[PDB]
Subunit: 122 residues, 4 copies
């Protein structure tokens, strides 16, 4: 699914996910969030299953963004975990965990969870 | 926290997380799971905040493993999202999302969630 | 939002959520899942904020179903946590955690996570 | 596990979970959080598997607290999903989702996730 995954994706928030899928299972690229303490692109890296089943199942993958770049630092990191579904209207359906650096006393409050769906159009 | 993070970590399941933290915010290394459809090491990649706050807060980070290697393929990927806490007994406290590739009809059933704590000893 | 919440809702899977919102903040009713090890209705109980903000924010709520009834027992329980959004096309947007009873050795594998959106029509 | 579950539990934060397990699978009681926008007891309700497997597996359960009482309203609700494990040192191991009522524009930011372990002593 190297061809399928590689390219520019957009989620329901208007965020922009630009990713290259390597033959070796690597995901590399940049993320631009439309919301939160973020601006411009952030480096991302991740992994996908480069030899998925051939039974109609999606392709498992994930990636991470640490929310620091040359412009801003939000002292947090999000990971997206999901699968790529090919075909007519390709999608990457994910759930994500956003952890902010906290003191021990506030750690119970450290992690947001949500879900993003990415498509090739937006 | 480049020095702090880099090295060998172990979680409560006996899994082994071997990671190098780069000056540029990169996480690279290998993961060996003690449970599940897995054996030997898998490539991981991720990101950490390379300029965290100086107020006692932890350092945000995350990484991804796609569960394919030269031995096995589980058609799944886990992402860990959490923070590194330095000091006397350093810890990386995470929550994780494990997504398996599924058909659309089974997608509701695609994602496990849990939490792992990593320490420098085990 | 007692009036708004009370009634029959349906999610994207075709499941049926029948709920009564009490003046005291109680949620009571029945759930019928369209997927998984389930058939017919299961008792649910839960809670909602009976005095929400008046600033356009949604109404926080949650409920639990244990997957045992007179027909089947799946030895599991799901909790939905989310908010009710009123207006033209009312919605209850949730994320859920489905925990299966496991042995200690399999506990890492005990919990599924996902998201369901409920509307008054389907 | 009616006998096992019923009683007073405490988590790692010092919160107090007081619960009665009914023969019909009901959970009823009160929760007192040691952290966050909360004070004194809040009503809880939930469900547990009243006929669990007899193979060493834990007992699935869940409950909800809406964070409104006679003293405070935080416009939020937490659901705990997990399992009760009996024996020498009984535990209820959970993961939780805390949803705050938000505007649509802030909904991506609505839900915290974490994990609490409850024991009979603290
Ligand atoms: Rh969705
Ligand atoms: Rh923990
Ligand atoms: Rh959605
Ligand atoms: Rh734990």
């Amino acid at each position: 699914d190297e061809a399928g995954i590689t390219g520019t994706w957009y989620n329901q928030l208007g965020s922009t996910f630009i990713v290259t899928a390597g033959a070796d299972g690597a995901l590399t690229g940049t993320y631009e969030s439309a919301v939160g303490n973020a601006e411009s692109r952030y480096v991302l890296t991740g992994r996908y299953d480069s030899a998925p089943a051939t039974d109609g199942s999606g392709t498992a993958l994930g990636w991470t963004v640490a929310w620091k770049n040359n412009y801003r630092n939000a002292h947090s990191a999000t990971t997206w975990s999901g699968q790529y579904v090919g075909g007519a209207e390709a999608r990457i359906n994910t759930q994500w965990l956003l952890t902010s650096g906290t003191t021990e006393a506030n750690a119970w409050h450290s992690t947001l969870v949500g879900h993003d769906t990415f498509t090739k159009v937006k």
